[PDB]
Design an enzyme around this catalytic site. Structure first.
Site, PDB file in Angstrom:
ATOM      1  N   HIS A  40       0.862  -1.359  -0.001  1.00 48.88           N
ATOM      2  CA  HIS A  40       0.122  -0.140  -0.054  1.00 48.88           C
ATOM      3  C   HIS A  40       0.833   1.122   0.094  1.00 48.88           C
ATOM      4  O   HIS A  40       0.287   2.478   0.036  1.00 48.88           O
ATOM      5  CB  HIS A  40      -1.038   0.087   1.074  1.00 48.88           C
ATOM      6  CG  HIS A  40      -0.492   0.367   2.501  1.00 48.88           C
ATOM      7  ND1 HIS A  40       0.109  -0.612   3.308  1.00 48.88           N
ATOM      8  CD2 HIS A  40      -0.163   1.556   3.051  1.00 48.88           C
ATOM      9  CE1 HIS A  40       0.158   0.128   4.667  1.00 48.88           C
ATOM     10  NE2 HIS A  40       0.176   1.422   4.245  1.00 48.88           N
ATOM     11  N   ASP A  84      -0.033  -7.699   2.000  1.00 49.59           N
ATOM     12  CA  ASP A  84       0.431  -6.334   1.734  1.00 49.59           C
ATOM     13  C   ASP A  84       2.158  -6.076   1.795  1.00 49.59           C
ATOM     14  O   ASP A  84       2.901  -5.842   2.879  1.00 49.59           O
ATOM     15  CB  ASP A  84       0.007  -5.440   2.954  1.00 49.59           C
ATOM     16  CG  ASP A  84       0.261  -3.848   2.821  1.00 49.59           C
ATOM     17  OD1 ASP A  84       0.624  -3.463   1.822  1.00 49.59           O
ATOM     18  OD2 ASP A  84      -0.033  -3.073   3.995  1.00 49.59           O
ATOM     19  N   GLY A 175       2.658   6.508   8.597  1.00 45.54           N
ATOM     20  CA  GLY A 175       4.113   7.127   8.442  1.00 45.54           C
ATOM     21  C   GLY A 175       5.121   5.878   8.612  1.00 45.54           C
ATOM     22  O   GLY A 175       6.358   6.131   8.057  1.00 45.54           O
ATOM     23  N   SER A 177       4.388   2.634   8.012  1.00 44.04           N
ATOM     24  CA  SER A 177       4.161   1.707   7.035  1.00 44.04           C
ATOM     25  C   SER A 177       5.153   1.299   6.320  1.00 44.04           C
ATOM     26  O   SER A 177       5.910   2.106   5.753  1.00 44.04           O
ATOM     27  CB  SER A 177       2.813   2.003   6.287  1.00 44.04           C
ATOM     28  OG  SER A 177       1.613   2.084   7.023  1.00 44.04           O
ATOM     29  N   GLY A 178       5.168  -0.100   5.989  1.00 41.29           N
ATOM     30  CA  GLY A 178       6.397  -0.413   5.009  1.00 41.29           C
ATOM     31  C   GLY A 178       7.634  -0.704   5.821  1.00 41.29           C
ATOM     32  O   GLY A 178       8.628  -1.392   5.416  1.00 41.29           O
TER      33      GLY A 178
END
Ligand SMILES: [Ca+2]
Length: 223
Positions: A40, A84, A175, A177-178
């Site tokens: 995402h 994801d 923020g 995320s990943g």
């Protein structure tokens, strides 16, 4: 990261910041030319920034490298956030050293109760917004599947796992995320989603990296 602490310059050498004129997601360096992040977080024109601490000032040790290609998982579903995960190939190999190093992929999944390190430059407040300049760290345990499912019945414990504190106050956030979830020196998770941030009974949900190792290797090998 809510309720965390300042990591310390380059203490998380595999932490990556995805930049598109500003920081928008985190990532993990798994080798000299590949980064793993969340699907995402996909966007065109991504510049990968390695060796970062204070993301607003050039301090030395940074390596800015453009992404040559971003590979989102074919079965990624944007509504459920299932699968994801995304692979990013760097235009050029990064120069590995003491401040920029890769993190190892797991050979087995982690069990509940395992303590992990989560890091990022995401929002630091449960209510309102406040983005830090330097990297924040948070130590969190992986929760049992039963607790994870009782928290939200929209997770697939086969591709997701919960980690954090049910009492609230400590969690990853917008923020982050990943970003990486490292336990025992192995990358076990990717910051994916959650209901709000650091809320009571609402732990963070992460991509279960151990069930994607085969895909990772096959994809990297053919690209
Ligand atoms: Ca910097």
């Amino acid at each position: 990261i809510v309720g965390g602490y300042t990591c310390g310059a380059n203490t998380v050498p595999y932490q990556v910041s995805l930049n598109s004129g500003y920081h928008f997601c985190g990532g993990s360096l798994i080798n000299s030319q590949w980064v793993v992040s969340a699907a995402h977080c996909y966007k065109s024109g991504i510049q990968v920034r390695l060796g970062e601490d204070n993301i607003n000032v050039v301090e030395g040790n940074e390596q800015f490298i453009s992404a040559s290609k971003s590979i989102v998982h074919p079965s990624y579903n944007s509504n459920t956030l299932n699968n994801d995960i995304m692979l990013i190939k760097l235009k050029s190999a990064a120069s590995l050293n003491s401040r920029v190093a890769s993190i190892s992929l797991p050979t087995s999944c982690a069990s509940a109760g395992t303590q992990c390190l989560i890091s990022g430059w995401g929002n630091t407040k449960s209510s309102g917004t406040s983005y830090p300049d330097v990297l924040k760290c948070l130590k969190a345990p992986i929760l049992s599947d039963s607790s994870c499912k009782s928290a939200s019945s929209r997770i697939i414990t086969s591709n997701m796992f919960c980690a954090g504190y049910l009492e609230g106050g400590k969690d990853s956030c917008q923020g982050d995320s990943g970003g990486p979830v490292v336990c025992s020196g192995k990358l076990q998770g990717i910051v994916s989603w959650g209901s709000g941030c650091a809320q009571k009974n609402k732990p963070g949900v992460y991509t279960k990296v151990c069930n994607y190792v085969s895909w990772i290797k096959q994809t990297i090998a053919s690209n």
